[PDB]
Amino acid sequence: DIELTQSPSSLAVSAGERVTMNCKSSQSLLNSRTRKNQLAWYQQKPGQSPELLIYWASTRQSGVPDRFSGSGSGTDFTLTISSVQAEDVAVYYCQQSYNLLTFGPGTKLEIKREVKLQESGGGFVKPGGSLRVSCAASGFTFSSYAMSWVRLAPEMRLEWVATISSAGGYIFYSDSVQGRFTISRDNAKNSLHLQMGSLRSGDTAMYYCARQGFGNYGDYYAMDYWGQGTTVTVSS
């Protein structure tokens, strides 16, 4: 039951300055069996899905400019940008996978002046209703990756809700959706579904399917490809 805090919540700087953002974990994230700090960092610009910046506290994701680096171990972590740029405006979140899957509250950074996951099926419903968001996968071997649904509630916070394993043998839910939501996958047609029942206003969010990444040296404990996000609005 790990709580991550981030600081500062918000700051504005000028192009080219260095910034450091911190992430403090209420409990150590260094896993002694695996040798790794199960902590990742995401950048989310407005109107887009999160993008994986760093995992294992310090390993930069492929394709990320090297002005981004991650540091720290145990309970205190840091993301720094050496010479920030205009395209670096976004909210930055840290994310631990030591116990379940939980995100920090985010740091909003302002500047003072063929893998595809296409989603479908959001919309409006009233409390008690049901909806089914879905995720079509293309451009990679769907049946090798575990897949996850995480949402962005209006209040700026990301929240993991469900995970299904690569072959579909193992299924995990957040307590906040357990018994109401049902995740499923079909590895024959490369699709992922979230069947949502007994919807409540707290369920209103942008909903993202996302691929649990892994490499030749182990799972990232992070998600490297996200769909575009479909809105779910619980009514009245």
Numbering used by the authors: 149 to 384
Pull verbatim passages from the article behind this deposition.
Mucin 16 (MUC16) overexpression is linked with cancer progression, metastasis, and therapy resistance in high grade serous ovarian cancer and other malignancies. The cleavage of MUC16 forms independent bimodular fragments, the shed tandem repeat sequence which circulates as a protein bearing the ovarian cancer biomarker (CA125) and a proximal membrane-bound component which is critical in MUC16 oncogenic behavior. A humanized, high affinity antibody targeting the proximal ectodomain represents a potential therapeutic agent against MUC16 with lower antigenic potential and restricted human tissue expression. We describe the crystal structures of a single chain h4H11-scFv and describe its interaction with MUC16ecto composed of 26 residues (31thLQNFTLDRSSVLVDGYSPNRNEPLTG6th; numbering from TM) to understand the binding mechanism through the comparison of the apo and the MUC16ecto-bound scFv at 2.36 Å and 2.47 Å resolutions, respectively.
The scFv, [VH-linker (GGGGS)5-VL], was secreted into the culture media under the control of the signal peptide located at the N-terminal and then, purified as pure homogeneous monomers using Ni-affinity and SEC. Structural analysis demonstrated that all six CDR regions are composed of 5 flexible loop-like coils, a short-helix (α1), and canonical disulfide bonds at the C22-C96 of VH and C23-C94 of VL that are formed to improve the correct folding and thermo-stability. The overall architecture of the scFv is ∼ 37 Å tall and ∼ 46 Å wide between the tips of neighboring loops. The VH domain of the scFv is composed of 11 β strands (β1–β11) and 2 short helices (α1−α2), while 13 β strands (β1–β13) and one short helix (α1) for VL. The C-terminal of VH is connected to the repeated Gly-Ser linker loop and following VL begins from D149 residue. Our crystal structure also revealed that the straight distance from the C-terminal of VH to N-terminal of VL was ∼ 32.0 Å, corresponding to a distance of approximately 13 amino acids (∼ 2.7 Å per aa). It is worth noting that the number of amino acids constituting the linker region between VH-VL must be more than 13 residues to prevent an inactive or aggregated form due to the insecure space for interaction between VH-VL. The VH-VL complex are likely relatively independent of each other, and associate only through the interface. A buried solvent-accessible area of 926 Å2 (calculated by PDBePISA v1.52) capable of forming hydrogen bonds, an energetically cation- π interaction (∼ 5.6 Å distance) between cationic sidechain (R44 at VH), and an aromatic sidechain (F251 at VL) may improve overall stability between VH-VL. In contrast, the scFv in complex with ligand MUC16ecto showed only one melting point at each pH value. These findings imply that the apo scFv (VH-VL) has a higher independence at even pH 4.4 and unfolding of the scFv can be inhibited depending on the MUC16ecto ligand.
